[PDB]
């Protein structure tokens, strides 16, 4: 049983410091790369930091370099995010996410429950665009969500590094599609992904009850990893 | 003298079969193919050297994507390689290091291996935990596991030094159909492309064609003078090739029920460990104890080429499903990819 | 002795079965194999090598 | 090359695997590899148990309890083998009341393999074992198949049949369990990491797998000394000792073991010393002209095995006389084996 349990959230004054923890169980923690992704209260997903399996490679988002430190304690199966100089724009739910990289793997396939951090009052990056912010749907119908990238996500190796996630209301995001067309494990075959280079489509056939939520696309072509603003599926 | 009456009746039945076989030997493959052009310059080069095993390699098997492959070594490691990049995808630590065979499930979801533990171990490549886990230890052979091939994710066929082959239900761990009749160690097996038949080669110097679903031997092929270490179907499933300790490979035809051709050189006297056809069947590739792979013209019996890139026995080889490459595995601890 | 008699009649049963099978002529068998090779030679990259741009083990 | 982000992370993983493999390889290259060979029942798996006992602090009381059903199964099968041999050899019970016990024995042998040894079964076995006709058959066991531990358990039936019975280490060492496939154990001793492999149940042609053990440090070849007087089977070509000699000849002189030390465990010396008092060595070696003392007969058997060495000037056989079930003897002998390995490399 795969578990990721974040902790350390709370209310903090601006300029203060706070260490988040993510406790892993039920999988080979040290074999996975690990990310922190955060979500501001009424907003989308934003990638924060990455530490590879073996800790040899660490990347930070620009808005966070200098202030946040990602680290892991592999013997204790724990991921950390040490935050400093906390600003108002850091107020978010913080997700711990596992990601293993090898030929044919499925990155970003398990997300924690999230821990909430609240801070009190006082260009070269790839742009991912979901021009449609919400869509009303009725059960049994078929939907098509769209996403576009400011650069081609199709690589010379033939893979197109595009991911689709679903966030149901009140829950953590769930992987749906990896590398533009591969169905994640446990996802029903009514989902499918397609596209080419800079334009991509997620299609659901005979849309069911549980399908309602917010759908985010994400590029894994290069760092920083970047998401689209998200498309919501509303019931009619 | 009941055993006398039976032992003599078998000799008459063998003579009837020999006569029936002679009756339909109206020509030889060699004379039939005399007119066609030889294949000529087969100049294959090593395109990859897969490094990382630290003891003899005994077996390998390409996955059906023609890119991933699994190899088994006496260093106690089962390695899955991305042959395009040479990246190691997984290195699986074996409970018993005395391995003789491995296989890649056509789905890519599982590999198998085994050896002197007499066990066919099934390994799940797609776990929630993220690492490779033993999902089944198939127990019941009483001699070493010499070869195995998945039919799909729930069924696998094995051959054993105990002189049997077996069809297994992986879920229940039981041998559900057995294949008995060899009188010496079974060294190698090869599934027909439609998986309805398989052929086996044994140390009784015979090859046997088995009906998978009926659980019995359809045909028995003799001609070799010593152990058959290796066997492989011709791509249309109507013939197969063997490799033997008698230093020859041989082509056998199912519907004509007899040997069609021998592949040998007078100055090659060492054992053969492994055989495989190219995609069209025109080339028969064979691995030899003398450290080389010889490439035979399967239609004309001339040697077309040599792969000389190992410092110890070539123990295994395989050709990708797309036909693009051949892999060789060796006692010298390396695999090489050639085309 | 009693085990040699059981195995000996299993060999007779197997040979009896094998004697009764349907066999084709080697000339037909050999012709079919040659026809298969000829029909598939163009899609055999080890027989008829492809340009380096089409060869995954020479590309990148 | 210009790799994608997932490609770079895959390369990094591969390099981490390489570091692990290199490290594993360094450890494995330091291993002292020992290959146990010998005929079935020569004592190989018992030597493996002794390595666990001596060098792995093995067979605790709690582990020993799991052998209770095996002890019971061994005991039941032994007395049954003897009873069945009486009908075959025409041996009658010393007391006719035992004929009912013998009928009950086969009936009570319908209980499963659990904690059995009901007081009823135990009493049936105790009465049969004490019978003079059963003892007469037991003393002719060289004429049929019988576990060497038969007397050991049957003579201790009182202790064994108690409902609070906890198997001892010697009880475990005395058990007979037939297995298939290689049996392995590893342990450290005198700063050497040992890996010992018992080929075990392997029904196949040796010539196809023996080359796999090219490079092992030493072979330990086990011989049941007490097999010397066993009557030939129905279609048996040679007696058990000569089949052992045939296997040893093949092993000792094998081209793949040229740089491998050959150690000979002449085992079951305790049973052999008792048997040679009553059963002459000429049953095994009709040309033997020495006396039937333990010392002379054991030396002669050793000679017969060591003479099989076709390379005496370049290769030396290291012969030990062992009782594999005796922990102190195996400890002393393996200590000597180890010193020889140390002094030679
Ligand atoms: N009395 C006695 N019994 C022994 C000796 N060595 C082995 N045994 C017993 O003989 C039986 C067969 O031994 P085992 O280790 O199973 O032989 P293996 O087939 O080579 O593994 C077991 O019941 C052992 O307890 C010995 O030196 N003396």
Residue numbers in the entry:
A (entry chain H): 1 to 122, 135 to 248
B (entry chain B): 2 to 340
C (entry chain G): 5 to 64
D (entry chain A): 3 to 347
From the reporting publication:
In order to better understand the recognition mode of mAb16, we crystallized a fully soluble heterotrimeric Gi1 in complex with mAb16 fragments. We tried both a Fab fragment (Fab16) and single-chain variable fragment (scFv16) derived from mAb16. The overall structure of Gi1 in complex with scFv16 is very similar to Gi1 alone. The relative position of Ras-like domain and alpha-helical domain of Gαi1 moves closer to Gβ1 by a small rotation movement around the αN-b1 junction. This slight movement leads to two additional interactions between Thr182 of Gαi1 and Asn119 of Gβ1, and Arg205 of Gαi1 and Thr143 of Gβ1, located in Switch I and Switch II region, respectively. The structure of the Gi1/scFv16 complex shows that scFv16 recognizes an epitope composed of the terminal part of the αN helix of Gαi1 as well as part of the Gβ1 subunit. The complementarity-determining region 3 of the heavy chain (CDR-H3) extends to interact with Gβ1 with its tip and Gαi1 with its side. CDR2-H2 and CDR-H1 support the interaction with Gαi1 and Gβ1, respectively by making hydrogen bonds and van der Waals contacts. CDR-L1 is exceptionally long and makes extensive contact with the edge of the αN helix together with CDR-L3.
Here we describe the development of an antibody, termed mAb16, that recognizes the heterotrimeric Gi/o type G protein and enhances the stability of GPCR-Gi/o complexes, while simultaneously adding an asymmetric feature that may aid with cryo-EM particle projection alignment. As antibodies typically bind to their targets in a rigid manner, such an antibody would be expected to enable structure determination of GPCR/G-protein complexes by cryo-EM. mAb16 recognizes a unique epitope, binding at the interface between the α and β subunits of heterotrimeric Gi. While the antibody confers extra stability to GPCR/Gi/o complex as well as increased resistance to GTPγS-triggered dissociation of the complex in a manner similar to Nb35 for Gs, mAb16 and Nb35 bind to completely different epitopes. The antibody confers the GPCR–Gi/o complexes the resistance to GTPγS-induced dissociation.
